[PDB]
Amino acid sequence: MSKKISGGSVVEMQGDEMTRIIWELIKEKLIFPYVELDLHSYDLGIENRDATNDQVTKDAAEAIKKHNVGVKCATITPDEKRVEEFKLKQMWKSPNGTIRNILGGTVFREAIICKNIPRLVSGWVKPIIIGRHAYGDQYRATDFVVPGPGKVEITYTPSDGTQKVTYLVHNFEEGGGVAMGMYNQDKSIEDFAHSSFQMALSKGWPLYLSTKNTILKKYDGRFKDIFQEIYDKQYKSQFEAQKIWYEHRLIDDMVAQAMKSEGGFIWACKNYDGDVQSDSVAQGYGSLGMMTSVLVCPDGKTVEAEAAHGTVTRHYRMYQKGQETSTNPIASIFAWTRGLAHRAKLDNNKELAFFANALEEVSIETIEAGFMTKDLAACIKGLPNVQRSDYLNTFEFMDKLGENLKIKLAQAKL
Amino acid sequence: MSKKISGGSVVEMQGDEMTRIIWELIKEKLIFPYVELDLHSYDLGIENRDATNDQVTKDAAEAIKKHNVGVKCATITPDEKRVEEFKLKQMWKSPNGTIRNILGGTVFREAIICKNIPRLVSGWVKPIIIGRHAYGDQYRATDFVVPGPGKVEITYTPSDGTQKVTYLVHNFEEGGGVAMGMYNQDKSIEDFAHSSFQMALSKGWPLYLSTKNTILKKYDGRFKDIFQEIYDKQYKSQFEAQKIWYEHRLIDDMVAQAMKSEGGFIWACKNYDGDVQSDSVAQGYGSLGMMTSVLVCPDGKTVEAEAAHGTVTRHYRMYQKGQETSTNPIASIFAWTRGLAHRAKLDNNKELAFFANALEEVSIETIEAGFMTKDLAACIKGLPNVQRSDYLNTFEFMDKLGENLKIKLAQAKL
Ligand SMILES: NC(=O)c1ccc[n+]([C@@H]2O[C@H](COP(=O)([O-])OP(=O)(O)OC[C@H]3O[C@@H](n4cnc5c(N)ncnc54)[C@H](OP(=O)(O)O)[C@@H]3O)[C@@H](O)[C@H]2O)c1
Ligand SMILES: NC(=O)c1ccc[n+]([C@@H]2O[C@H](COP(=O)([O-])OP(=O)(O)OC[C@H]3O[C@@H](n4cnc5c(N)ncnc54)[C@H](OP(=O)(O)O)[C@@H]3O)[C@@H](O)[C@H]2O)c1
Ligand SMILES: [Ca+2]
Numbered sequence: 001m002s003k004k005i006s007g008g009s010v011v012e013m014q015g016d017e018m019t020r021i022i023w024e025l026i027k028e029k030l031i032f033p034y035v036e037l038d039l040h041s042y043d044l045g046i047e048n049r050d051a052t053n054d055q056v057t058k059d060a061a062e063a064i065k066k067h068n069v070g071v072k073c074a075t076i077t078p079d080e081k082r083v084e085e086f087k088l089k090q091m092w093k094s095p096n097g098t099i100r101n102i103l104g105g106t107v108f109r110e111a112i113i114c115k116n117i118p119r120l121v122s123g124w125v126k127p128i129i130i131g132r133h134a135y136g137d138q139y140r141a142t143d144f145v146v147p148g149p150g151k152v153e154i155t156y157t158p159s160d161g162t163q164k165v166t167y168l169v170h171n172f173e174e175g176g177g178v179a180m181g182m183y184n185q186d187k188s189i190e191d192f193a194h195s196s197f198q199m200a201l202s203k204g205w206p207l208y209l210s211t212k213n214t215i216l217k218k219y220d221g222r223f224k225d226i227f228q229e230i231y232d233k234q235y236k237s238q239f240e241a242q243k244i245w246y247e248h249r250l251i252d253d254m255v256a257q258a259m260k261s262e263g264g265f266i267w268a269c270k271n272y273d274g275d276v277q278s279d280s281v282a283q284g285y286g287s288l289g290m291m292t293s294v295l296v297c298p299d300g301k302t303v304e305a306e307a308a309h310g311t312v313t314r315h316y317r318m319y320q321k322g323q324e325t326s327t328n329p330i331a332s333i334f335a336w337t338r339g340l341a342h343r344a345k346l347d348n349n350k351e352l353a354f355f356a357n358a359l360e361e362v363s364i365e366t367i368e369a370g371f372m373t374k375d376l377a378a379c380i381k382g383l384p385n386v387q388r389s390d391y392l393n394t395f396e397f398m399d400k401l402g403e404n405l406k407i408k409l410a411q412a413k414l
Numbered sequence: 415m416s417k418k419i420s421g422g423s424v425v426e427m428q429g430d431e432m433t434r435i436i437w438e439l440i441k442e443k444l445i446f447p448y449v450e451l452d453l454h455s456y457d458l459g460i461e462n463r464d465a466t467n468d469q470v471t472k473d474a475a476e477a478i479k480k481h482n483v484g485v486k487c488a489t490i491t492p493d494e495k496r497v498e499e500f501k502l503k504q505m506w507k508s509p510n511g512t513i514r515n516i517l518g519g520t521v522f523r524e525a526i527i528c529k530n531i532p533r534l535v536s537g538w539v540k541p542i543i544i545g546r547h548a549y550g551d552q553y554r555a556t557d558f559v560v561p562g563p564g565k566v567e568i569t570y571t572p573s574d575g576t577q578k579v580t581y582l583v584h585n586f587e588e589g590g591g592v593a594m595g596m597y598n599q600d601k602s603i604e605d606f607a608h609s610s611f612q613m614a615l616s617k618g619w620p621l622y623l624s625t626k627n628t629i630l631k632k633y634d635g636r637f638k639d640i641f642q643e644i645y646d647k648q649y650k651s652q653f654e655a656q657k658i659w660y661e662h663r664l665i666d667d668m669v670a671q672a673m674k675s676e677g678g679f680i681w682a683c684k685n686y687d688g689d690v691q692s693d694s695v696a697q698g699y700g701s702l703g704m705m706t707s708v709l710v711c712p713d714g715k716t717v718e719a720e721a722a723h724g725t726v727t728r729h730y731r732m733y734q735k736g737q738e739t740s741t742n743p744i745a746s747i748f749a750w751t752r753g754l755a756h757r758a759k760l761d762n763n764k765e766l767a768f769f770a771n772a773l774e775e776v777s778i779e780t781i782e783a784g785f786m787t788k789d790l791a792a793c794i795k796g797l798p799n800v801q802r803s804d805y806l807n808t809f810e811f812m813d814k815l816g817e818n819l820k821i822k823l824a825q826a827k828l
């Protein structure tokens with residue numbers, strides 16, 4: 001609509017439920033008024049994905065390869081109950097898995113900190129950065145139900161023409177169950193290691209990798225060996241210069257060490273662990289609504305910013321019944337600022353870069369000034385002691401943000 | 415030596431490193447002096463397992479089936495570095511996986527609480543109980559290294575050999591990587607559900623199950639469907655009477671909800687999640703050294719008690735160097751007490767039951783009186799502010815418990 005700064009090419013991906021509502025408020029009140037964009041939109045709402053048989057999801061991924069920058073809204077991943085809810089043709093796969101599998105790379109997640117917000121974990125005075133391997137494992141697996149007594153096996157047929165190898169997975173003598181198979185590639189694991197070592201060096205913090213190699217001796221063993229190998233041959237000396245270090249730990253030990261630490265380190269996580277632990281860490285610092293998530297591709301030019309949390313169904317349900325909601329929009333806001341910032345970097349656009357940072361400090365300034373959504377208010381007071389007066393609802397908060405942004409930009413221009 | 419209370423038949427499993435040292439101190443100073451047990455002993459130390467080609471591990475599991483009660487010390491699970499350390503014949507599999515796979519059931523883990531010990535997580539004023547499915551998944555999988563380009567497929571064959579379903583896992587056309595197969599059985603998942611619903615009813619607390627069914631639609635979907643099914647048909651009404659409830663949550667949502675909760679609920683976890691989260695929860699309340707872990711078998715008669723943590727190798731290295739150490743023995747002691755307490759329940763042995771509870775309160779009384787190992791001292795003071803005078807070394811702590819126990823048992827008679 002009414003815009004002024006030249007933003008450039010950006011790939012936008014619309015989402016579902018509560019986040020879809022918030023997403024539009026962000027563009028209308030915080031972005032469009034000040035930035036003119038060459039926008040490429042792809043509606044990843046559950047209805048449009050079903051309509052296009054999920055083709056829209058693949059088109060978006062490819063669009064990101066071309067334009068180099070994407071910003072995504074949380075989306076719904078269908079299970080049986082969802083198929084029945086929207087009368088879907090199929091139980092579509094996670095659009096995040098599809099995008100990540102096509103782009104590849106590492107998803108770096110970190111909390112968004114405000115000085116007036118108490119944490120649930122007492123010692124985290126420094127930031128914890130998680131590097132989630134964005135490829136393979138459970139997010140590209142094959143699983144099915146075992147109908148009754150029978151044999152389940154997994155085989156490998158070499159392109160080198162030698163004899164195929166067959167391994168027994170299990171002999172179901174009586175009754176059925178379930179089975180599945182998953183995998184990962186060396187090249188992808190290699191990129192994962194490089195991005196981890198590089199992130200630790202740019203921050204000047206130690207690096208940790210977690211696996212369960214004692215149980216999955218071959219599978220996880222490969223992650224552990226590739227990391228150690230690349231470290232010894234290309235990064236060990238650089239780490240020592242900055243007096244930092246790299247260590248591998250069993251997932252058990254790692255989550256406990258993290259819990260009692262004071263933060264200040266990079267945490268390389270396999271796909272699943274990175275998925276689960278980034279939520280635990282976000283909640284630890286305060287709220288799932290306060291965290292950044294950016295997929296950094298192996299090219300060092302392409303990026304996809306997103307909100308790590310989901311569509312927030314519980315809040316949407318309330319909305320549908322006419323009950324007042326107080327959903328944190330910051331995570332969704334920082335997906336735009338982080339993306340536009342990268343856009344700025346790639347175009348040497350100082351104005352856009354200025355805008356991206358300006359919106360980020362306005363978000364933090366607002367909350368520290370005392371205006372926040374219910375989740376952050378519960379951090380200060382106890383959830384049981386939170387009063388309606390301690391916070392603004394979803395839309396009152398977007399309005400306040402809007403005014404503050406308008407004031408800061410004016411302050412800058414004048 | 416001495417002994418006085420008739421204890422009955424108990425299967426003991428010796429372990430490795432730091433926990434092996436502690437294990438002997440427990441028998442010599444806390445058990446043997448007051449109880450004469452019919453011990454059917456098995457050495458699960460890494461050296462004896464290698465010597466017997468791991469047969470000793472299977473003999474122990476079978477012994478537990480026969481005598482109905484076992485108590486186990488933490489053990490080492492070999493990876494390449496361990497094979498080189500002890501010059502092992504093979505990279506032996508986890509003895510815990512072997513025992514659990516043979517016995518089946520659910521492993522219930524819970525923290526051991528002391529009033530004077532501060533938590534890392536602020537809101538947990540009530541206990542969190544984890545029910546870890548002890549069968550299948552990653553702990554009975556088939557993983558291998560993929561040497562180069564080729565195809566990996568997984569298949570199922572009815573026992574009547576009439577057909578064969580083949581699913582494509584992945585086409586490796588660029589290089590190599592890894593792949594694996596895993597499974598589970600309906601019957602085992604069914605026992606898991608029943609034990610979870612029953613535990614919630616005996617405690618009078620809500621129950622939660624976590625899975626990632628949105629991604630592993632068939633595999634995790636089966637867990638979710640079996641739980642809901644058994645709930646609706648056999649437990650829903652009983653839950654409502656006690657005003658409690660059951661809900662399924664995505665693993666993402668679950669770990670975050672747990673982090674900000676006040677505790678007071680049963681948490682049904684798939685094998686892997688139960689493995690990882692029980693460590694995070696233990697550290698949250700204070701220390702990995704303060705947690706109980708008991709495998710409750712389907713037969714509702716056989717039980718296996720253990721410590722949830724490992725052999726504590728790091729402390730063990732300082733021990734070998736001839737350096738003074740301070741390692742929490744509490745978890746190892748409760749493995750003996752809960753095991754003896756079950757033996758008492760089965761034989762209707764009142765004297766033994768009194769003894770088991772007496773040792774448990776002595777452990778708690780000692781710490782609350784101000785005598786503890788370094789880990790607990792760091793909970794009170796900050797780790798950076800802990801002084802030697804603030805804690806006892808392992809040998810000093812065991813001796814203090816030993817004297818306190820002597821007192822209580824003397825008053826328990828005189
Ligand atoms: N596209 C994605 O990246 C993504 C990621 C995760 C889940 N999902 C999808 O989202 C749907 C719901 O999944 P879920 O239940 O696990 O949801 P979720 O979106 O992660 O939210 C679960 C809970 O987290 C809290 N929360 C999350 N974001 C919040 C915010 N911005 N402000 C305040 N509180 C927030 C709320 O707790 P209270 O209810 O206690 O306030 C909410 O009920 C599913 O269809 C799922 O597939 C998508
Ligand atoms: N048999 C079992 O049930 C079991 C379970 C887990 C691991 N393991 C085995 O044990 C070995 C070591 O594995 P890991 O490194 O993950 O070890 P771990 O035994 O879990 O200990 C890891 C860290 O946890 C803390 N910790 C654990 N128990 C403690 C106690 N009793 N008192 C005080 N602090 C305690 C220590 O932290 P600080 O160093 O910071 O003090 C220690 O270095 C491996 O060979 C593994 O296969 C066996
Ligand atoms: Ca997540």
Ligand SMILES: [Ca+2]
Nearest residue numbers: 252689690693
């Ligand atoms: Ca564990």
